[PDB]
């Protein structure tokens, strides 16, 4: 909830 650690923006 703090960071979207699973965000699709990552590589």
């Amino acid at each position: 909830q703090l960071i979207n650690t699973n965000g699709s923006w990552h590589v």
Partner: antibody
Amino acid sequence: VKLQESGGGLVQPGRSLKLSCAASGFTFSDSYLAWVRQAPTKGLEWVASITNSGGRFYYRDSVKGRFTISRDNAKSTLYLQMDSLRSEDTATYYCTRMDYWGQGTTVTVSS
Amino acid sequence: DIVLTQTTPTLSATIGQSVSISCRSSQSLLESDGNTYLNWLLQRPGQSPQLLIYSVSNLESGVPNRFSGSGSETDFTLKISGVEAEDLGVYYCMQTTHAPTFGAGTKLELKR
């Protein structure tokens, strides 16, 4: 929780610099971290971020190809290799877990 | 890229007054997992950003109850119910649903 940046200083353009973030008071290997910079004219910016065990990372369009994020879970340290530095990169560098931020390290790039 | 807009760049308040800092997003911040990744940070003079509220409305441990967050999918609001001297600084909204971006900040100065 405790986080401590280091590595900041003055450099000319094109030069390289490596920051580091000493971590204590938490299980570093379970935490997702980020490098956030603060310039006067640009404001707050997400530079690079990485995953708890590695595997996934992120670099903003401005820093792709020049910057490198990494971590040593055994040493509780987060890193940012900044190569081919520009005046645009001038800002104060924060190592963060969002809930906890470090005091920062200032990076100045000028001729 | 997501644009976070903080309409009012400066807010003047007296000690004890209630205040609302707004953030508007260019696109919906609701992620596939049903969570909306909007955070609120306070930067006191000469100090580093500090997390106040995460996921629109969740109060971070150690943050006084006078702070509260609310929002839709594109409209977000931080509320300070009775401002104190320690609340003076710049308040930044921030998202991670998409490639992370920050708003430009709201300066909370003291009315005199």
